Design the sequence.
């Protein structure tokens, strides 16, 4: 997914 | 009475004994399979007479059945094997990537993703030709050259472990050469799966979404960092985690080439690095759902 | 009681080291499983104008190669049948198990259909166009050898010299100078079926064009290629039909088809009109050979 | 006296950790073996007792709520  | 509880934390021996009996099986399985592999799998794909620049030309020349065909999109490139789909939407589709079972490891370095890997096709038993496609990733070089012969459309299909299929069509698709890190680019979206490649995952607001856009992203393999997640920590790389070779961008909204999680549903406490690796298309089935079937095919668009 | 933390502490430790080793062995497993399934069919590197060109270049084992007639747009795969004497035969038709459906159309008979095996164990049709460019190259006579075999193991061949297939414009017209002989008999010269004193004339094949159910060019009222369900140089209709239906056992009759057609892999000058060959093979080679 | 709860509460976090590292391995191994299906003669037909592992995580996660006598 995305990466904080 | 502080010795009625430590006595109770005996369930620690119980567990610890289970995890030593498991390691037992796992050790035996790995040895069994290791033997099984002393002997390889074989195919005899007798080549079809008809041929062309790609599959669009072959369906036009009479190649009506979907199976392995030989193509030569150029009088300077050694004709190579490939699987053509002559049934899905008027046929003529040149399969670029395919997932259907868990027969092939997609976690490979930069070179294998360059050259291609996996099985193009296997025999339909009783038949002397390979009418069944295998799992593969036709090299990056071959996919690049193929998209740079003229306009090219891309069809991405997938199915869950229940039967539902959804599409994702991109009327425009190109892939630069290796010097440009096989940079991808697409446009003209249709389908019913969600324009992940272009608009990132539809389920995360703000910067979180934009950072999951593949369009315009370079290509990366765990041994070659070209993602859009800047960090000097060698362990923090979209390909290392997530497990595939793909146009990652910190990281993804789509992840074909991911790990083939049998059954469909899977969770963070199952993933190697705890990320959502696995055949994933977020805009459709979440982040913790690995597709049973997922493919990528192309056509000239003419 | 302080005995507890003695076992466990170690059962979790050693069995925890078991793992370090397990992950190590599993990484060696993942190595083997990288190779793809080994494919049997392979293609040789030697290429040429045709199978003879290849043979005269060093080739030695019958198999699949690419050939490019000086007048072809793109090279293409063929099955070169080579012997222990330098002869380079290039096959363009094959039948041996009814595996392939020969009821194809103009484009399919034009471009070619079927499968090419490195061991001549597959049925196919190279393609009229490909056949044309090979037979009508840069001035050099080609010979055609038809090889038959019944359902008993007996073979017979029929040779034709100055073999050539026309361009699409003339409908890949078939032509040869003369029958060169063979225990198969010259069926391309028509056959006295007796069902009419003119059978001979109406069943001859030299000089006919190619026909397909969606492209009738024969000398019959209706469509020969549509009645038989094939593609061939039909007249009205045939004496030698190697692209008919593949009948098992070889025997069949009027009761095989709802119209009593004598379709099927026939060649009258050797077997009756109702015996379908088991194996069949048409190949060509420069006349200035054998 | 209480010099024996830490040992347990060390072992406590140590096991859960191994129970986890294990569930992951179990799976990583199922995936790896299946990826031999298209490389070898055959692939070992196996099943993964996910059930059991979860059954044990819940159970251990339980015991981690003990006391010390605060
Ligand atoms: C994008 O990601 C952030 C992550 O910070 C999401 O909201 C935060 O997520 C953290 C987990 O790191 C949770 O504690 C909270 O739900 C949120 N806390 C913060 C950072 O305010 C959210 O989905 C998105 N927010 C942004 C930064 O755009
Ligand atoms: Ca690997
Ligand atoms: Ca990076
Ligand atoms: Ca007619």
Sequence:
């Amino acid at each position: 997914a995305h990466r904080p | 009475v502080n010795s009625n509880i430590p006595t109770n934390l005996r369930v620690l021996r119980s567990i610890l004994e289970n995890l030593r009996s498991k390691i037992q099986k796992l050790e035996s399985d790995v040895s069994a399979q290791m033997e099984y592999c002393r002997t390889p799998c074989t195919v005899s794909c007798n080549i079809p007479v008809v041929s062309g620049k790609e599959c669009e030309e072959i369906i036009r020349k009479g190649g009506e059945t979907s199976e392995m065909y030989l193509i030569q999109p150029d009088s300077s490139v050694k004709p190579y094997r490939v699987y053509c789909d002559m049934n899905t939407e008027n046929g003529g589709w040149t399969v670029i990537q395919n997932r259907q079972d868990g027969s092939v490891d997609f976690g490979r370095k930069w070179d294998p993703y360059k050259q291609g890997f996996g099985n193009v096709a296997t025999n339909t038993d009783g038949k002397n030709y390979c009418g069944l496609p295998g799992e593969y990733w036709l090299g990056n070089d071959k996919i690049s050259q193929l998209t740079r012969m003229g306009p090219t459309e891309l069809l991405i299909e997938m199915e869950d472990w229940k039967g539902d299929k959804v599409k994702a069509h991109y009327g425009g698709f190109t892939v630069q050469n290796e010097a440009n890190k096989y940079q991808i680019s697409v446009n003209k979206y249709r389908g019913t799966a969600g324009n992940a490649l272009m608009d990132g995952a539809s389920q995360l607001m703000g910067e979180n979404r934009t950072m999951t856009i593949h369009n315009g992203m370079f290509f990366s393999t765990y041994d070659r960092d070209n993602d859009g997640w800047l960090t000097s920590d060698p362990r923090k790389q979209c390909s290392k985690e997530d497990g595939g070779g793909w146009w990652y961008n910190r990281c993804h909204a789509a992840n074909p080439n991911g790990r083939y999680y049998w059954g469909g549903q899977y969770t963070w406490d199952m993933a190697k690095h705890g990320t959502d690796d696995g055949v994933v298309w977020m805009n459709w089935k979440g982040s913790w759902y690995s597709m049973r079937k997922m493919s990528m095919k192309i056509r000239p668009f003419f | 009681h302080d005995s507890s933390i003695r076992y466990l502490q170690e059962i979790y430790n050693s069995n925890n080291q078991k793992i370090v080793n397990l992950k190590e062995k599993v990484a060696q497993l993942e190595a083997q499983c990288q190779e793809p399934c080994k494919d049997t069919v392979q293609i040789h590197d030697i290429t040429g104008k045709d199978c003879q060109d290849i043979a005269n270049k060093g080739a030695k084992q019958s198999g699949l190669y690419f050939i490019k007639p000086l007048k072809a747009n793109q090279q293409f795969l063929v099955y070169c049948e080579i012997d222990g004497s330098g002869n380079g035969w290039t096959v363009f038709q094959k039948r041996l198990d009814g595996s392939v459906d020969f009821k194809k159309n103009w484009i399919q008979y034009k471009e070619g259909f079927g499968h090419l095996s490195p061991t001549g164990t597959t049925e196919f049709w190279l393609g009229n166009e490909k056949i044309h460019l090979i037979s009508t190259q840069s001035a050099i006579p080609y010979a055609l050898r038809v090889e038959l075999e019944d359902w008993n193991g007996r073979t017979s061949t029929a040779d034709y010299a100055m073999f050539k297939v026309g361009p699409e414009a003339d409908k890949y017209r078939l032509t040869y100078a003369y029958f060169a002989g063979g225990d198969a008999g010259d069926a391309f010269d028509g056959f006295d079926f007796g069902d009419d004193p003119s059978d001979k004339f109406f069943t001859s094949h030299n000089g006919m064009q190619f026909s397909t159910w969606d492209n009738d060019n024969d000398k019959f009222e209706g469509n020969c290629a549509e009645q038989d369900g094939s593609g061939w140089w039909m007249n009205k209709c045939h004496a030698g039909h190697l692209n008919g239906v593949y009948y098992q056992g070889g025997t069949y009759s009027k009761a095989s088809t709802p119209n009593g057609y004598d379709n099927g892999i026939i060649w009258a000058t050797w077997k009756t009109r109702w015996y379908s060959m088991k194996k069949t093979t048409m190949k060509i080679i420069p006349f200035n050979r054998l | 006296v209480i010099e024996k709860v830490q040992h347990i509460q060390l072992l406590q976090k140590n096991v859960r950790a191994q129970l986890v590292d294990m569930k992951r391995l179990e799976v990583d191994i199922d995936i790896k073996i299946r990826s031999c299906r298209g490389s070898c003669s055959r692939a070992l037909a196996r099943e993964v007792d996910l059930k059991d592992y979860e059954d044990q995580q819940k159970q251990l996660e339980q015991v981690i709520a003990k006391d010390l006598l605060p």
Summary: The two ends of chain C are 98 Å apart (CA to CA). The pocket of calcium ion (ligand 2) is lined by residues B 105, 107-108; C 30 (CB under 6 Å).
